[PDB]
Amino acid sequence: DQGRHLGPVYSINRSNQNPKYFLSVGDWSCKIWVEDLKTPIIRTKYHGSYLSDGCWSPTRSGAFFLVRRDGWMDVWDYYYRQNEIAFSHKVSDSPLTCIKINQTGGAYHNSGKLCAIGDQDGTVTILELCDSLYTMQPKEKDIINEMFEREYRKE
Amino acid sequence: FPQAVKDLKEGVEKCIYQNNQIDLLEEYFEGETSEHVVENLSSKTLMLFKD
Amino acid sequence: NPLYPDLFAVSLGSYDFTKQRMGLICLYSLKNTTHPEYAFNCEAGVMCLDFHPKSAALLAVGLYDGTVLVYDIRNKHKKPIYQSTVRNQKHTDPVWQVKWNPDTSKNYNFYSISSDGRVMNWILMKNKLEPEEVILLRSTLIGLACGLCFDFNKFEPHIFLVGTEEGKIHKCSRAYSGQYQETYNGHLLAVYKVKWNNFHPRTFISASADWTVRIWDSKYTSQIICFDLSMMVVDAVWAPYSSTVFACATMDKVQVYDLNVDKLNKLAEQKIVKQPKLTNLSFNYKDPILLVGDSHGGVTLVKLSPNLCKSGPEIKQTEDKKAMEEFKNVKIEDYEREKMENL
Amino acid sequence: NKLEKIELGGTKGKTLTESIAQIFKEFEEAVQAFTSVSYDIMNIAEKKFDDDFYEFRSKIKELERRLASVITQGFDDYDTIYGRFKLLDNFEGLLTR
Amino acid sequence: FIDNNFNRFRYSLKLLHKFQSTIKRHNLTSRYNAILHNYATELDTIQRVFQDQKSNPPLVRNMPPEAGKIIWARHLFQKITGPINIFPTEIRRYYGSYNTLGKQLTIYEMWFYQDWVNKIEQSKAALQATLIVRHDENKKLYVNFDLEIMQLIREAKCLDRQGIEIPESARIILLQEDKFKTYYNELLYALKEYERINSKIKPICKNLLLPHIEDLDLKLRPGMVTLTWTSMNIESYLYYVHQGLKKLEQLIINVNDIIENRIENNLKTVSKVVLV
Amino acid sequence: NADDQLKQLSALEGANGYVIFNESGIPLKRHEKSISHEKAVHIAALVSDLWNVSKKVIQRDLKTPENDIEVIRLRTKHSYEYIITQSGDFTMLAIQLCGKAIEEAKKAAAAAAAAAVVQEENKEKEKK
């Protein structure tokens, strides 16, 4: 009834750190829903064009990345500011069809360091994320669980 | 001997008072680093794959 | 600096409004007086400089165009750690008073009062600063009231006193953004500095452009005691070591008054530097030394006499450890009661 | 009582809830003063209760003033029409006239 | 005992309290003589202060000299009136105080009128000039805001606080003062943000990305020179500038990531290769 | 009279001990806190070698006629300070500490007192 998306849902994902919380990216704005609540716990803003794919960071539960169809990728971090995007980057002029984030790792690459985004043009770009974004911040897991539970109780 | 020791001590005491006023070797905020320092998030394209 | 008594920082600023020049912030260590321990260059003169009580390194800087600068002493580069911009809602005109909130639970809290008159609360973040308006100065007049100073009671964090250019001192509460707890109409001119008395709550001393120094009780709507000086009063600061002791510097004359020693007459009057007018004066908590700032930027420290001290009727009488933080509080109440009987 | 139950969980969390918790406690503290009700019992002849009411009236206004501030901060924080509207629904019955 | 009490009083507010106890019992005549004489002494020090503070009065902190000087004169006149009213020989002291006040009101009223006529004409010219301007030597965009408009706005606000009636033309600017501050703050933030974006671009790319840098000036330039400060939709124009910066940031950030990450790591690895 | 000077040296803040050396090198009087005689024999030999070398060096090595060292102060790591003053044929070494060092010493003394009190309490418990 209240969670119907304006456009068809394209990507459904759940944070590796917490299985109960999963975010579905549909049309202009992706939403986050709890395991037993029909309605979405948190709706985040609105975005230019549409969001083709959004995926949770495996290393850090708090920050999830959504790639828009305008060729701009914006990273949402709930650890610092829920209200605004942590940063916005333009991968290419062509629309980004999908985004995939690496898990586990080897050699010089840690979990979440490299993100692969596929453009409509057909080029694939791997972006090395900042160490602060990929590395877990102090008490991130405790803070995110308290905020999500509090939001769930409010809903 | 008696006169010299009071006099010598007096001189030693005078040296003690000047040093006692200020440490003079202390280093303000010695050792501790910058601690919190703003960091800009950054993104670096490592490579591009195209057909 | 709270951590080290020897290190004190004076930030040079340009007064008179029409003449504007770059202001250099210099921290002068007591060990070396030949040159400043730390030298900082700023685009505009620094109106106010403050040090966080919990950490000596954190420094709060207020400059012309309302820019708010945060500086870390530890950093070698010496560039400002944080800055205020139009997107960060930095206030207009000049931020005359800037202070550091003692509570560290919510990261670090920065309090700044602009010339326009908007109390601003700044919380330190990572590569970003968040500003929150505590209150608006806000009468058949155009625009917001101008505020030249603001102070926070140590005993109660919620109640804070903010001075105004209009000349009416306003007691304010953090909880009510749009409401005024109380207003004092005693001053006829803008109050340069308002400070709560040490060791007591609901008491403060305010220095105004009109050449009069007034001590007020928060419960009362008028100043309990008013001191008249022919020379215009620039600022008044309470003594940290003992209550009912304050210093006022006016037109090259600095006067210290103790209520117990004399009801009206100033205990001591001095002129540290004959050539220049004194822009401001500060008090050191650790020792009885007063810092006086001249118009030319020269800063001279004057050590007070041992004649004035707390628990002076009898030396080491009753052995009360509690009395140092309680008898001083008790003594002002007794002095305050005497003023009520006279009026 | 309804205000204590509210769990908005929007934007900044815990610090806002702690302030809300103190406000709910503040109301309980007022009830404990008024709640004790020494003598009183709504006597028409006794005017002591009326004096307590005026003191209680100031306490409710203080509670309401704090609610206005926290409510205004929350509305600015959401930054979206849907988010701000959701907060209004939670406080729909909590409006203090 | 009574004599000692009188000396202590010679503070005026405090004296009344002492008198109340005294009221129940030539002490009354002496008290009136002391009060009348005390008022005269206060008027004399204020009169000397008025002459001393004439040329260079100490204005309220962060207060305009034209408005600050007027406020100081008004406050001195109010203080004289309060003691004159308290005073209610006695007639001679009152006559002198009235002469001084009459001088304060007559001179300052003419003084207040002169400042507004000069300031209002100067303020209008500063307010209506393009949007932003770039120094020829500096070659960088700068906010074209005028200090006099800000100075006039601060002084205009002060008159309302003291209850003085400002002119209707001055009031119109004061009503829109809040809107101007926000517009000025956004423009300053954009210029500071603009420099930060330029700093991010590396030197090699600078020439390659020079046409893109021109586009920001190209989109900004019509708004810069045709807004005329009080445009019907300036805030909307500011929104366009923000959209342009975001588009420039996206491409610039992607270029920096491609250069500072994937290409740099390859070249660095080849240098550290050794292969022997 | 002579005994009072040793008490006076201890009274001065930042003073740990005082050692007096004769021309021969025998230590006349030393502080009780510092080792007595064994430390004095070891301190007197080092100061005489240093004082004699410095006195000889100033006159010849610096090529300055009639120039004699009056006081030598050696500041080392932590709070150590060793002012040396020569009166007539007797030269003494004074060891003083900085404010932080003095505070640390006071804390140590307090800890020792607390330990003694605890021991006394334990003894009382054993007696009970």
PDB file of C-alpha atoms in Angstrom, chain C residues 81-317:
ATOM      1  CA  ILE C  81      41.603  23.218  10.466  1.00  0.00           C
ATOM      2  CA  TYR C  82      38.027  24.441   9.734  1.00  0.00           C
ATOM      3  CA  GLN C  83      36.402  27.493   8.046  1.00  0.00           C
ATOM      4  CA  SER C  84      32.864  28.978   7.703  1.00  0.00           C
ATOM      5  CA  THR C  85      31.371  29.627   4.205  1.00  0.00           C
ATOM      6  CA  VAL C  86      28.076  30.931   2.645  1.00  0.00           C
ATOM      7  CA  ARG C  87      26.952  27.263   2.192  1.00  0.00           C
ATOM      8  CA  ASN C  88      27.766  26.703   5.933  1.00  0.00           C
ATOM      9  CA  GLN C  89      25.541  29.797   6.711  1.00  0.00           C
ATOM     10  CA  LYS C  90      28.448  31.895   8.118  1.00  0.00           C
ATOM     11  CA  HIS C  91      27.011  35.099   9.708  1.00  0.00           C
ATOM     12  CA  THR C  92      27.567  38.600   8.171  1.00  0.00           C
ATOM     13  CA  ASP C  93      29.315  41.690   9.714  1.00  0.00           C
ATOM     14  CA  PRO C  94      31.818  40.775  12.503  1.00  0.00           C
ATOM     15  CA  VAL C  95      31.742  37.966  15.157  1.00  0.00           C
ATOM     16  CA  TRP C  96      32.783  40.031  18.240  1.00  0.00           C
ATOM     17  CA  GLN C  97      32.531  37.136  20.763  1.00  0.00           C
ATOM     18  CA  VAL C  98      33.460  33.441  20.161  1.00  0.00           C
ATOM     19  CA  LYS C  99      33.522  30.717  22.889  1.00  0.00           C
ATOM     20  CA  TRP C 100      34.106  26.917  23.212  1.00  0.00           C
ATOM     21  CA  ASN C 101      31.310  24.835  24.834  1.00  0.00           C
ATOM     22  CA  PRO C 102      32.734  22.711  27.740  1.00  0.00           C
ATOM     23  CA  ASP C 103      30.599  19.585  26.978  1.00  0.00           C
ATOM     24  CA  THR C 104      32.380  17.174  24.552  1.00  0.00           C
ATOM     25  CA  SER C 105      29.579  14.542  24.369  1.00  0.00           C
ATOM     26  CA  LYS C 106      28.324  15.994  21.029  1.00  0.00           C
ATOM     27  CA  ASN C 107      31.825  16.219  19.427  1.00  0.00           C
ATOM     28  CA  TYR C 108      33.078  19.837  19.853  1.00  0.00           C
ATOM     29  CA  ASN C 109      30.637  22.792  20.200  1.00  0.00           C
ATOM     30  CA  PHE C 110      31.647  26.302  18.973  1.00  0.00           C
ATOM     31  CA  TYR C 111      29.591  29.382  20.046  1.00  0.00           C
ATOM     32  CA  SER C 112      29.922  32.620  17.993  1.00  0.00           C
ATOM     33  CA  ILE C 113      28.000  35.958  18.325  1.00  0.00           C
ATOM     34  CA  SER C 114      27.951  38.091  15.111  1.00  0.00           C
ATOM     35  CA  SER C 115      27.532  41.920  14.811  1.00  0.00           C
ATOM     36  CA  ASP C 116      24.249  41.210  12.892  1.00  0.00           C
ATOM     37  CA  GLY C 117      23.045  39.302  16.015  1.00  0.00           C
ATOM     38  CA  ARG C 118      22.481  35.547  15.507  1.00  0.00           C
ATOM     39  CA  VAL C 119      23.977  33.179  18.124  1.00  0.00           C
ATOM     40  CA  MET C 120      25.610  30.371  16.078  1.00  0.00           C
ATOM     41  CA  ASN C 121      26.455  26.876  17.416  1.00  0.00           C
ATOM     42  CA  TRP C 122      29.177  25.104  15.356  1.00  0.00           C
ATOM     43  CA  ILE C 123      29.794  21.326  15.748  1.00  0.00           C
ATOM     44  CA  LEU C 124      33.148  19.923  14.494  1.00  0.00           C
ATOM     45  CA  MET C 125      32.687  17.196  11.804  1.00  0.00           C
ATOM     46  CA  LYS C 126      34.923  15.382   9.255  1.00  0.00           C
ATOM     47  CA  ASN C 127      35.824  17.801   6.385  1.00  0.00           C
ATOM     48  CA  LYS C 128      32.556  19.703   7.164  1.00  0.00           C
ATOM     49  CA  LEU C 129      31.074  22.129   9.778  1.00  0.00           C
ATOM     50  CA  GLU C 130      27.368  22.142  10.823  1.00  0.00           C
ATOM     51  CA  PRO C 131      25.940  25.497  12.095  1.00  0.00           C
ATOM     52  CA  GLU C 132      22.831  25.734  14.361  1.00  0.00           C
ATOM     53  CA  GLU C 133      21.260  29.107  15.379  1.00  0.00           C
ATOM     54  CA  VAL C 134      20.726  29.072  19.199  1.00  0.00           C
ATOM     55  CA  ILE C 135      18.642  32.335  19.328  1.00  0.00           C
ATOM     56  CA  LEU C 136      17.846  35.524  17.315  1.00  0.00           C
ATOM     57  CA  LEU C 137      18.433  38.929  19.013  1.00  0.00           C
ATOM     58  CA  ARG C 138      15.195  40.403  17.501  1.00  0.00           C
ATOM     59  CA  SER C 139       9.866  46.902  18.996  1.00  0.00           C
ATOM     60  CA  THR C 140       9.425  49.621  16.296  1.00  0.00           C
ATOM     61  CA  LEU C 141      12.892  49.058  14.701  1.00  0.00           C
ATOM     62  CA  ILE C 142      14.261  47.706  11.358  1.00  0.00           C
ATOM     63  CA  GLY C 143      16.393  44.499  11.298  1.00  0.00           C
ATOM     64  CA  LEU C 144      17.796  42.175  14.028  1.00  0.00           C
ATOM     65  CA  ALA C 145      19.360  43.744  17.179  1.00  0.00           C
ATOM     66  CA  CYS C 146      23.212  43.956  17.104  1.00  0.00           C
ATOM     67  CA  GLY C 147      25.030  41.894  19.803  1.00  0.00           C
ATOM     68  CA  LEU C 148      28.632  42.786  20.823  1.00  0.00           C
ATOM     69  CA  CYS C 149      29.168  40.002  23.434  1.00  0.00           C
ATOM     70  CA  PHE C 150      27.800  36.679  24.832  1.00  0.00           C
ATOM     71  CA  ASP C 151      28.692  34.533  27.912  1.00  0.00           C
ATOM     72  CA  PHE C 152      27.627  31.084  29.284  1.00  0.00           C
ATOM     73  CA  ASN C 153      27.117  30.513  33.057  1.00  0.00           C
ATOM     74  CA  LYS C 154      29.541  27.766  34.241  1.00  0.00           C
ATOM     75  CA  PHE C 155      27.003  26.534  36.876  1.00  0.00           C
ATOM     76  CA  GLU C 156      24.086  26.197  34.382  1.00  0.00           C
ATOM     77  CA  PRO C 157      24.830  25.504  30.654  1.00  0.00           C
ATOM     78  CA  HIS C 158      21.253  26.318  29.462  1.00  0.00           C
ATOM     79  CA  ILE C 159      21.304  29.965  30.740  1.00  0.00           C
ATOM     80  CA  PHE C 160      23.637  32.260  28.701  1.00  0.00           C
ATOM     81  CA  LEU C 161      23.882  36.117  28.807  1.00  0.00           C
ATOM     82  CA  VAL C 162      24.231  38.042  25.485  1.00  0.00           C
ATOM     83  CA  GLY C 163      25.167  41.776  25.339  1.00  0.00           C
ATOM     84  CA  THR C 164      23.697  44.103  22.664  1.00  0.00           C
ATOM     85  CA  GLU C 165      24.696  47.315  20.797  1.00  0.00           C
ATOM     86  CA  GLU C 166      21.238  48.762  21.689  1.00  0.00           C
ATOM     87  CA  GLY C 167      22.405  48.721  25.357  1.00  0.00           C
ATOM     88  CA  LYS C 168      19.996  46.160  26.856  1.00  0.00           C
ATOM     89  CA  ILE C 169      21.653  42.965  28.255  1.00  0.00           C
ATOM     90  CA  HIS C 170      19.501  39.846  27.592  1.00  0.00           C
ATOM     91  CA  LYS C 171      19.598  36.588  29.630  1.00  0.00           C
ATOM     92  CA  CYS C 172      19.026  33.665  27.212  1.00  0.00           C
ATOM     93  CA  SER C 173      18.129  29.932  27.446  1.00  0.00           C
ATOM     94  CA  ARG C 174      19.394  27.314  24.914  1.00  0.00           C
ATOM     95  CA  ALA C 175      16.030  25.444  25.093  1.00  0.00           C
ATOM     96  CA  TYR C 176      13.959  28.485  23.933  1.00  0.00           C
ATOM     97  CA  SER C 177      15.360  29.798  20.592  1.00  0.00           C
ATOM     98  CA  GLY C 178      12.604  32.442  20.125  1.00  0.00           C
ATOM     99  CA  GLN C 179      12.050  33.420  23.788  1.00  0.00           C
ATOM    100  CA  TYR C 180      14.036  35.671  26.206  1.00  0.00           C
ATOM    101  CA  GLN C 181      14.233  34.493  29.862  1.00  0.00           C
ATOM    102  CA  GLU C 182      14.832  38.101  31.067  1.00  0.00           C
ATOM    103  CA  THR C 183      15.973  41.566  29.808  1.00  0.00           C
ATOM    104  CA  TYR C 184      18.019  44.284  31.630  1.00  0.00           C
ATOM    105  CA  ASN C 185      17.501  47.950  30.539  1.00  0.00           C
ATOM    106  CA  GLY C 186      20.036  49.500  32.980  1.00  0.00           C
ATOM    107  CA  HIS C 187      22.769  50.309  30.386  1.00  0.00           C
ATOM    108  CA  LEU C 188      22.213  53.379  28.113  1.00  0.00           C
ATOM    109  CA  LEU C 189      24.931  52.285  25.595  1.00  0.00           C
ATOM    110  CA  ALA C 190      26.265  49.084  23.925  1.00  0.00           C
ATOM    111  CA  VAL C 191      27.858  46.660  26.470  1.00  0.00           C
ATOM    112  CA  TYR C 192      31.349  45.580  25.260  1.00  0.00           C
ATOM    113  CA  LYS C 193      31.711  42.602  27.670  1.00  0.00           C
ATOM    114  CA  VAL C 194      29.357  40.645  30.026  1.00  0.00           C
ATOM    115  CA  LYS C 195      30.884  37.941  32.309  1.00  0.00           C
ATOM    116  CA  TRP C 196      29.369  35.769  35.115  1.00  0.00           C
ATOM    117  CA  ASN C 197      31.101  36.209  38.528  1.00  0.00           C
ATOM    118  CA  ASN C 198      33.298  33.226  39.580  1.00  0.00           C
ATOM    119  CA  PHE C 199      32.163  30.921  42.502  1.00  0.00           C
ATOM    120  CA  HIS C 200      28.516  32.168  42.292  1.00  0.00           C
ATOM    121  CA  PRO C 201      25.439  31.692  40.023  1.00  0.00           C
ATOM    122  CA  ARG C 202      22.957  34.385  38.741  1.00  0.00           C
ATOM    123  CA  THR C 203      25.586  37.193  39.139  1.00  0.00           C
ATOM    124  CA  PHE C 204      27.643  39.023  36.441  1.00  0.00           C
ATOM    125  CA  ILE C 205      29.581  42.264  35.625  1.00  0.00           C
ATOM    126  CA  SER C 206      29.024  44.164  32.328  1.00  0.00           C
ATOM    127  CA  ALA C 207      31.286  46.840  30.726  1.00  0.00           C
ATOM    128  CA  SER C 208      29.532  49.235  28.269  1.00  0.00           C
ATOM    129  CA  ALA C 209      30.408  52.058  25.804  1.00  0.00           C
ATOM    130  CA  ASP C 210      28.740  54.500  28.262  1.00  0.00           C
ATOM    131  CA  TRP C 211      31.467  55.004  30.921  1.00  0.00           C
ATOM    132  CA  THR C 212      29.788  53.077  33.816  1.00  0.00           C
ATOM    133  CA  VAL C 213      30.475  49.539  35.205  1.00  0.00           C
ATOM    134  CA  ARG C 214      27.395  47.739  36.633  1.00  0.00           C
ATOM    135  CA  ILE C 215      27.118  44.461  38.656  1.00  0.00           C
ATOM    136  CA  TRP C 216      23.688  42.755  38.301  1.00  0.00           C
ATOM    137  CA  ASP C 217      21.738  39.905  39.988  1.00  0.00           C
ATOM    138  CA  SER C 218      19.902  37.590  37.522  1.00  0.00           C
ATOM    139  CA  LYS C 219      16.734  37.562  39.718  1.00  0.00           C
ATOM    140  CA  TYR C 220      16.723  41.423  39.826  1.00  0.00           C
ATOM    141  CA  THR C 221      15.797  43.545  36.745  1.00  0.00           C
ATOM    142  CA  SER C 222      18.378  46.296  37.577  1.00  0.00           C
ATOM    143  CA  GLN C 223      22.155  46.414  38.354  1.00  0.00           C
ATOM    144  CA  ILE C 224      22.855  45.991  42.126  1.00  0.00           C
ATOM    145  CA  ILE C 225      25.965  48.282  42.022  1.00  0.00           C
ATOM    146  CA  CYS C 226      27.031  50.891  39.394  1.00  0.00           C
ATOM    147  CA  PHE C 227      30.601  52.340  39.202  1.00  0.00           C
ATOM    148  CA  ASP C 228      31.153  55.718  37.445  1.00  0.00           C
ATOM    149  CA  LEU C 229      34.516  56.390  35.680  1.00  0.00           C
ATOM    150  CA  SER C 230      35.146  59.663  33.760  1.00  0.00           C
ATOM    151  CA  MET C 231      37.201  57.768  31.092  1.00  0.00           C
ATOM    152  CA  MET C 232      35.077  55.488  28.820  1.00  0.00           C
ATOM    153  CA  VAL C 233      35.048  51.871  30.175  1.00  0.00           C
ATOM    154  CA  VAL C 234      36.415  49.350  27.609  1.00  0.00           C
ATOM    155  CA  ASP C 235      35.967  45.999  29.463  1.00  0.00           C
ATOM    156  CA  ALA C 236      35.494  44.439  32.957  1.00  0.00           C
ATOM    157  CA  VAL C 237      36.778  40.930  33.927  1.00  0.00           C
ATOM    158  CA  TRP C 238      36.041  38.976  37.177  1.00  0.00           C
ATOM    159  CA  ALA C 239      39.007  37.582  39.189  1.00  0.00           C
ATOM    160  CA  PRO C 240      39.273  33.738  38.897  1.00  0.00           C
ATOM    161  CA  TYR C 241      41.094  33.199  42.260  1.00  0.00           C
ATOM    162  CA  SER C 242      38.533  35.082  44.454  1.00  0.00           C
ATOM    163  CA  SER C 243      34.909  36.329  44.031  1.00  0.00           C
ATOM    164  CA  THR C 244      33.934  40.078  44.226  1.00  0.00           C
ATOM    165  CA  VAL C 245      37.254  41.075  42.508  1.00  0.00           C
ATOM    166  CA  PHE C 246      37.233  42.656  38.997  1.00  0.00           C
ATOM    167  CA  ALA C 247      39.470  44.849  36.772  1.00  0.00           C
ATOM    168  CA  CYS C 248      38.296  47.707  34.465  1.00  0.00           C
ATOM    169  CA  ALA C 249      40.732  49.404  32.021  1.00  0.00           C
ATOM    170  CA  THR C 250      39.720  52.898  30.767  1.00  0.00           C
ATOM    171  CA  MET C 251      41.747  55.462  28.679  1.00  0.00           C
ATOM    172  CA  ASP C 252      45.242  54.136  29.756  1.00  0.00           C
ATOM    173  CA  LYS C 253      44.049  53.557  33.378  1.00  0.00           C
ATOM    174  CA  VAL C 254      43.462  50.038  34.852  1.00  0.00           C
ATOM    175  CA  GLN C 255      41.465  49.792  38.126  1.00  0.00           C
ATOM    176  CA  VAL C 256      40.866  46.666  40.322  1.00  0.00           C
ATOM    177  CA  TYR C 257      37.945  46.722  42.828  1.00  0.00           C
ATOM    178  CA  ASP C 258      37.295  44.360  45.795  1.00  0.00           C
ATOM    179  CA  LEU C 259      33.810  44.707  47.383  1.00  0.00           C
ATOM    180  CA  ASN C 260      35.079  43.664  50.869  1.00  0.00           C
ATOM    181  CA  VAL C 261      38.139  46.009  50.797  1.00  0.00           C
ATOM    182  CA  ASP C 262      36.148  49.112  49.659  1.00  0.00           C
ATOM    183  CA  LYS C 263      32.420  49.666  48.904  1.00  0.00           C
ATOM    184  CA  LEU C 264      33.052  52.206  46.069  1.00  0.00           C
ATOM    185  CA  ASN C 265      36.718  53.420  45.958  1.00  0.00           C
ATOM    186  CA  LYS C 266      38.989  51.454  43.543  1.00  0.00           C
ATOM    187  CA  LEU C 267      41.660  49.469  45.466  1.00  0.00           C
ATOM    188  CA  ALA C 268      44.385  50.219  42.868  1.00  0.00           C
ATOM    189  CA  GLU C 269      44.757  52.423  39.724  1.00  0.00           C
ATOM    190  CA  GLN C 270      47.725  52.009  37.303  1.00  0.00           C
ATOM    191  CA  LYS C 271      48.856  52.921  33.730  1.00  0.00           C
ATOM    192  CA  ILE C 272      51.030  50.038  32.374  1.00  0.00           C
ATOM    193  CA  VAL C 273      51.756  51.852  29.039  1.00  0.00           C
ATOM    194  CA  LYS C 274      51.484  55.705  28.820  1.00  0.00           C
ATOM    195  CA  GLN C 275      51.589  55.977  24.960  1.00  0.00           C
ATOM    196  CA  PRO C 276      48.641  53.626  24.021  1.00  0.00           C
ATOM    197  CA  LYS C 277      44.914  53.179  24.961  1.00  0.00           C
ATOM    198  CA  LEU C 278      44.049  49.665  26.276  1.00  0.00           C
ATOM    199  CA  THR C 279      41.862  47.681  23.773  1.00  0.00           C
ATOM    200  CA  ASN C 280      41.178  44.822  26.265  1.00  0.00           C
ATOM    201  CA  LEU C 281      42.308  43.136  29.549  1.00  0.00           C
ATOM    202  CA  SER C 282      42.315  39.407  30.573  1.00  0.00           C
ATOM    203  CA  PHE C 283      42.745  37.492  33.895  1.00  0.00           C
ATOM    204  CA  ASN C 284      44.927  34.369  34.541  1.00  0.00           C
ATOM    205  CA  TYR C 285      43.314  31.601  36.698  1.00  0.00           C
ATOM    206  CA  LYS C 286      46.631  29.983  37.878  1.00  0.00           C
ATOM    207  CA  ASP C 287      48.407  33.077  39.360  1.00  0.00           C
ATOM    208  CA  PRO C 288      47.425  36.711  40.234  1.00  0.00           C
ATOM    209  CA  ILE C 289      48.694  38.217  36.906  1.00  0.00           C
ATOM    210  CA  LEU C 290      46.578  40.538  34.669  1.00  0.00           C
ATOM    211  CA  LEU C 291      47.223  40.848  30.884  1.00  0.00           C
ATOM    212  CA  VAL C 292      46.493  44.335  29.394  1.00  0.00           C
ATOM    213  CA  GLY C 293      46.279  44.907  25.603  1.00  0.00           C
ATOM    214  CA  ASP C 294      47.239  48.312  24.097  1.00  0.00           C
ATOM    215  CA  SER C 295      45.886  49.935  20.862  1.00  0.00           C
ATOM    216  CA  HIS C 296      49.297  49.291  19.139  1.00  0.00           C
ATOM    217  CA  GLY C 297      49.009  45.498  19.781  1.00  0.00           C
ATOM    218  CA  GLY C 298      51.602  45.532  22.569  1.00  0.00           C
ATOM    219  CA  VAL C 299      50.513  43.134  25.362  1.00  0.00           C
ATOM    220  CA  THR C 300      51.807  43.791  28.926  1.00  0.00           C
ATOM    221  CA  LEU C 301      51.133  41.527  31.958  1.00  0.00           C
ATOM    222  CA  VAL C 302      50.838  43.212  35.405  1.00  0.00           C
ATOM    223  CA  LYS C 303      51.020  41.075  38.604  1.00  0.00           C
ATOM    224  CA  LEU C 304      48.446  42.042  41.305  1.00  0.00           C
ATOM    225  CA  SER C 305      49.451  42.776  44.959  1.00  0.00           C
ATOM    226  CA  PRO C 306      49.089  40.185  47.801  1.00  0.00           C
ATOM    227  CA  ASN C 307      46.966  42.659  49.872  1.00  0.00           C
ATOM    228  CA  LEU C 308      43.750  41.326  48.217  1.00  0.00           C
ATOM    229  CA  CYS C 309      42.986  37.636  49.042  1.00  0.00           C
ATOM    230  CA  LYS C 310      40.043  35.302  49.948  1.00  0.00           C
ATOM    231  CA  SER C 311      39.349  34.229  53.596  1.00  0.00           C
ATOM    232  CA  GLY C 312      41.234  37.356  54.823  1.00  0.00           C
ATOM    233  CA  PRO C 313      39.491  38.219  58.180  1.00  0.00           C
ATOM    234  CA  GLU C 314      41.613  35.523  59.932  1.00  0.00           C
ATOM    235  CA  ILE C 315      44.519  33.583  58.291  1.00  0.00           C
ATOM    236  CA  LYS C 316      43.975  29.761  58.276  1.00  0.00           C
ATOM    237  CA  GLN C 317      40.842  30.115  60.496  1.00  0.00           C
TER     238      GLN C 317
END
